[PDB]
Design a protein around this ligand. Structure first.
Ligand SMILES: CC(=O)N[C@@H]1[C@@H](O)[C@H](O[C@@H]2O[C@H](CO[C@]3(C(=O)O)C[C@H](O)[C@@H](NC(C)=O)[C@H]([C@H](O)[C@H](O)CO)O3)[C@H](O)[C@H](O)[C@H]2O)[C@@H](CO)O[C@H]1O
Ligand SMILES: *[C@@H]1O[C@H](CO)[C@@H](O[C@@H]2O[C@H](CO)[C@@H](O[C@@H]3O[C@H](CO)[C@@H](O)[C@H](O)[C@@H]3O)[C@H](O)[C@H]2NC(C)=O)[C@H](O)[C@H]1NC(C)=O
Ligand SMILES: *[C@@H]1O[C@H](CO)[C@@H](O[C@@H]2O[C@H](CO)[C@@H](O)[C@H](O)[C@H]2NC(C)=O)[C@H](O)[C@H]1NC(C)=O
Ligand SMILES: *[C@@H]1O[C@H](CO)[C@@H](O)[C@H](O)[C@H]1NC(C)=O
Ligand SMILES: *[C@@H]1O[C@H](CO)[C@@H](O)[C@H](O)[C@H]1NC(C)=O
Lengths: 321, 172
């Protein structure tokens, strides 16, 4: 009579199924989830500077729609646009809206520097009841609606050189009246024109007379354009009517700033990764919450679960029942 | 798995072994008992911790990107923006699927391997004083009191001590 010595390994009562090269489901002792599939529903206010747009799109804050005046000179890592946002100034369009929104979002600032443009022989600071500011008529804070002085609108020809060491972003526009009566009444000339140029580029916009749909008291429109002026270059603005003039320029930065559409409330917490659904943890390498992300995020994948085996094959003793 | 120990020549695991991943069960003159092997247990765990930390290594931080949802139909440019994102997501989804498949196959093979490594090491300790029954158990051909069993488990078992005793019992 001697002895027996058996070698073996553990097992557990409750194993997990995982995928392998040879098996689509096979049981191991433990595994861990590699796909983040949940969010708190809330955007953490740290560590990124979150700016809630509230009632305002970035573009309306840029232009200076009065109910968006609170955004003057603001900065952000992430600007959050809400589905409840509305415009409440003169009706307008932006050809290439998406690009202007992108470049401003990326710049991360609305810092505005006023410049003393000289508009000889026109009336400045035009307003409208479409864009109330306090009790009276008003306008976009960063734009200067020019109309005739007396019975003339001369050829406007002005310059603003950039002798700084940073880029200037100028926002300007063109007024499209609904009737010929309106055109001549405001600008004298029967057809206006706006030419904005630098050494290397130029934009010429001819206004267009005609009704558009009635929006906030007006069938007319303003179209918004932009021009970047680099150090050593010069802005020239030439117009015989319909110019919506800049009051200055926006400072441009480069950096980590962006914009996101989300209705998630902002809360006091810390999360590197932000989605429109809210912040998510980033301990896992993959996520199924949203393909739209900002920050240090798991990579978006289609699977809602992927299990990484963290133990051996789980082999229970063959059972009698 | 590739080594054929776990779910192979070892019929099943031990739910009873709660202090380790691999180990020993014995029967001798003094009764029966169980003990975990720490080295093999730790080798498996260290290798699994290693791959876990490699996999969960944070490696991408992205800020301004392209838009991925659209409120207006636009055509060509939007088709491309969508296709770019859909292409990316599919490639990442594939990487993720392949990664877990490879990782998990390997995890099963390495755990199977570690079982086998402990078994071969034990077989080598016992030299000619035992025989492989073929089910993970050695029949030892001599008196092996708890001191002797623990000597095998903690690596101090001298086979020359019991060789004459054992060789006789084997061939007689
Ligand atoms: C400039 C002028 O002389 N305007 C007189 C109009 O006030 C007047 O009647 C109404 O105009 C209504 C819309 O009005 C404003 C506006 O709030 O938008 C008044 C502004 O002061 C004016 N701003 C400037 C800088 O000129 C502005 C502008 O002309 C238009 O927005 C251009 O699109 O118009 C509304 O349409 C009413 O239906 C209208 O009766 C008209 C007609 O009597 O006479 C104008 O002399
Ligand atoms: C409209 O406004 C612009 C902007 O000020 C005027 O441009 C300027 O035009 C003059 C010539 O008429 C240019 O002068 C030249 O400058 C060089 C120095 O580099 C000098 O050596 C030459 O002999 C010449 O005099 C000036 O550079 C130019 N300025 C800019 C910034 O482009 C334009 O003439 C105005 N037009 C009208 C009709 O008012
Ligand atoms: C995060 O939010 C998105 C939407 O912003 C959710 O996806 C939508 O929900 C269902 C599919 O589950 C669809 O009917 C919608 O069409 C989806 N929209 C999009 C744009 O994909 C998503 O399920 C949310 N996830 C979590 C975890 O909250
Ligand atoms: C198994 O892994 C989970 C994570 O999926 C972890 O929380 C737990 O501590 C592990 N359990 C055991 C018994 O090791
Ligand atoms: C915006 O900032 C500039 C300096 O960067 C300053 O000249 C201007 O007065 C500021 N305006 C507001 C409303 O803070």
């Amino acid at each position: 009579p001697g002895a027996t010595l058996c070698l073996g390994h553990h097992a557990v009562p409750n194993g997990t199924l995982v995928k392998t090269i040879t098996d689509d489901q096979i049981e191991v002792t433990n595994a861990t989830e590699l796909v983040q599939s949940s969010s708190t529903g809330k955007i953490c206010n740290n560590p990124h500077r979150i700016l809630d747009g509230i009632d305002c799109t970035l573009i309306d804050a840029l232009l200076g729609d009065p109910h968006c005046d609170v955004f003057q000179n603001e900065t952000w890592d992430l600007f959050v646009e809400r589905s409840k946002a509305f415009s409440n100034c003169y009706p307008y369009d932006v050809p290439d809206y998406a690009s202007l929104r992108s470049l401003v979002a990326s710049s991360g600032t609305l810092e505005f520097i006023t410049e003393g443009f000289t508009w000889t022989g026109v009336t400045q600071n035009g307003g409208s009841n479409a864009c109330k500011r306090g009790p009276g008529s008003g306008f976009f804070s960063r734009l200067n609606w020019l109309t005739k002085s007396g019975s003339t609108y001369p050829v406007l020809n002005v310059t603003m050189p950039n002798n700084d060491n940073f880029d200037k972003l100028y926002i300007w526009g063109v007024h499209h009246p609904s009737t010929n009566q309106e055109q001549t009444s405001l600008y004298v000339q029967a057809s206006g024109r706006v030419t904005v140029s630098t050494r290397r580029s130029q934009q010429t916009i001819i206004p267009n007379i005609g009704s558009r749909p009635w929006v906030r008291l007006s069938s007319s429109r303003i179209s918004i354009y932009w021009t970047i002026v680099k150090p050593g270059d010069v802005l020239v603005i030439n117009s015989n009517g319909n110019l919506i003039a800049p009051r200055g320029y926006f400072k441009m930065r480069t950096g980590k700033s962006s914009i996101m559409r989300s209705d998630a409330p902002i809360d006091t917490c810390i999360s590197e990764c932000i989605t429109p659904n809210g912040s998510i943890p980033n301990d896992k390498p993959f996520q199924n919450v949203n393909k739209i992300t900002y920050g240090a995020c798991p990579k978006y994948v289609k699977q809602n679960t992927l299990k990484l085996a963290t133990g051996m094959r789980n082999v229970p003793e063959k059972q009698t029942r | 798995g590739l080594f054929g120990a776990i779910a192979g020549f070892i019929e099943n695991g031990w739910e009873g072994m709660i202090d380790g991943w691999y180990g020993f069960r014995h029967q001798n003159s003094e009764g029966t008992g169980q003990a975990a092997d720490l080295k093999s247990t730790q080798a498996a765990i260290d290798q699994i911790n290693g791959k876990l930390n490699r996999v969960i290594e944070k490696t991408n931080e992205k800020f301004h990107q392209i838009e991925k949802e659209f409120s207006e139909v636009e055509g060509r440019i939007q088709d491309l923006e969508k296709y770019v994102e859909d292409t990316k997501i599919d490639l990442w989804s594939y990487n993720a699927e392949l990664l877990v498949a490879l990782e998990n196959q390997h995890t099963i093979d390495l755990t199977d391997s570690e079982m086998n490594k402990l078994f071969e090491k034990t077989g080598r300790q016992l030299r000619e004083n035992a025989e492989d029954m073929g089910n993970g158990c050695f029949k030892i051909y001599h008196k092996c009191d708890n001191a002797c069993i623990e000597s095998i488990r903690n690596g101090t078992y001298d086979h020359d001590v019991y060789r004459d005793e054992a060789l006789n019992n084997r061939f007689q």
